């Protein structure tokens, strides 16, 4: 038996994030943390050494005595968002045993929002369109459509690396004729509508 | 690494899987993992050289795996059941630490006639974003896609981006109420304005599909959904 937190962990960035998994037995040796993406496999993350370990942003602890493993992240960043499976092997052997995994999202520090929900028409000519609400800060949710046949994507984090700025956005379509961009963001902060 | 084959597989309920894994050379240890959404790995088979050490765990008489000659290994699911859709790892070690294959995503499906490829098209940007930011958002929108086994790509110029990028992590269900619902994916692409209104800058979202193959029979009056990639383009504007 390997446990680790329930999770999830919804910290904003720069936010201090601690971990902590047990195990059963006592003659356990080997200890690790993986991370995993959702559409991915385990990547071993770090091994927890009998004095721990240190990399940077992330530390790991193992208390033999208490029977448990921590990982602590500081100043966390978005790319540490993962699921964090803790790792052990099943006393006296080889094999191990991967805990159920604690999802982390860390959220984007956005400092200058501009909320702005935009209008965009397919560059086929159909005179179909979407509709994006972008620029919001890490603050401002976004929620599923209470309309059917109206369609809104959660919010995503896009990363314009070359020069350190990020934005949020979420997308909105319906096939419905009179849709307009303001049925699915509707109130929702003060954004510039065009 | 560790190689997988193949990377996605839609069957049927009913019908059998294989899934083909490679240690890293060398690795005397190779374990299969099935791995559910919301939980973490769990074995099913050990191998230690081609010898079979624990295979307890190892379902019933539905899953079988070989690693006959101690080098690469085959997993077999037959007949398979909708509560098989899963994620199926493959891990090689010497010791304790393992690394990981990169997975082979299964959906197990009621009926291969709901497989559809997906639509996609490109949404250019809004001429209201560029004034008041001086950027410009593209959005890319999948739709109708069944199972949900897709990538998702944006290039510009011939060539593969991921700065200014981000696609959802999960697809929406197009009817949440169904089982057998198709899915719709977005990305957004974002540049600068002055970039996309280089009418030479070339832009396309490139959505891989995994599907069926040549050796899949059909019978439905639109053409097979075959393992295919579907993509929309645009070119800037002035």
């Known amino acids: 038996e390997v446990e680790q937190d329930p999770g999830p962990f919804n910290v904003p960035e720069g936010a201090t994030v601690a971990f902590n998994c047990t195990y059963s037995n006592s003659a356990s040796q080997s200890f690790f943390w993986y991370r995993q993406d959702c559409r991915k496999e385990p990547k071993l993350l770090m091994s927890v050494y009998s004095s721990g370990n240190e990399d940077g942003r992330f530390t790991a602890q193992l208390n033999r005595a208490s029977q448990y493993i921590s990982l602590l992240i500081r100043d966390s960043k978005l790319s540490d968002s993962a699921t964090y499976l803790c790792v052990v092997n099943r006393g006296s052997s080889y094999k191990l045993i991967f805990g159920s995994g604690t999802r982390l999202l860390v959220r984007p520090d956005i400092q200058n929002p501009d909320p702005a929900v935009y209008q965009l028409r397919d560059s086929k000519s159909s005179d179909k369109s979407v509709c994006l609400f972008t620029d919001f800060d890490s603050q401002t949710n976004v929620s599923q459509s209470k309309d059917s046949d109206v369609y809104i994507t959660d919010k995503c984090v896009l990363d314009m690396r070359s020069m350190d700025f990020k934005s949020n956005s979420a997308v909105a379509w319906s096939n419905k004729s009179d849709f307009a961009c303001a049925n699915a963001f509707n109130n929702s902060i003060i954004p510039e509508d065009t | 690494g560790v190689a997988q084959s193949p990377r996605y597989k839609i069957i049927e309920k009913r019908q059998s899987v294989a899934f083909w894994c490679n240690p890293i050379?060398?690795?005397?240890?190779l374990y299969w993992y099935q791995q559910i959404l919301g939980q973490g790995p769990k074995l099913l088979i050990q191998?230690?050289?081609?010898?079979?050490?624990?295979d307890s765990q190892l379902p019933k008489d539905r899953f079988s795996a070989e690693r006959l000659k101690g080098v690469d290994s085959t997993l077999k699911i037959q007949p398979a059941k909708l509560e098989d859709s899963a994620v199926y790892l493959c891990?090689?070690?010497?010791?304790?630490?393992?690394?990981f294959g990169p997975g082979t995503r299964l959906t197990v499906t009621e009926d291969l006639k709901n497989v559809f490829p997906p639509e996609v098209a490109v949404f250019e940007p809004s001429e209201a974003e560029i004034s008041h930011t001086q950027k410009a958002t593209l959005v890319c929108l999948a739709t109708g896609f069944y199972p949900d086994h897709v990538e998702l790509s944006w290039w510009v110029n011939g060539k593969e981006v991921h700065s200014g990028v981000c696609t959802d992590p999960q697809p929406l269900k197009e009817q949440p109420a169904l089982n057998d619902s198709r899915y719709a994916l977005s990305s957004r692409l974002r540049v600068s304005a002055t970039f996309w209104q280089n009418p030479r800058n070339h832009f396309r979202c490139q959505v891989q599909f995994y599907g069926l193959s040549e050796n899949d029979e059909w019978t439905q009056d639109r053409a097979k959904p075959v393992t295919q990639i579907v993509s929309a383009e645009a070119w800037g504007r002035a």
């Open positions: 891990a090689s070690s010497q010791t304790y630490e393992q690394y």
């Open positions: 050379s060398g690795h005397a240890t």
């Open positions: 191998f230690q050289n081609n010898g079979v050490v624990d």
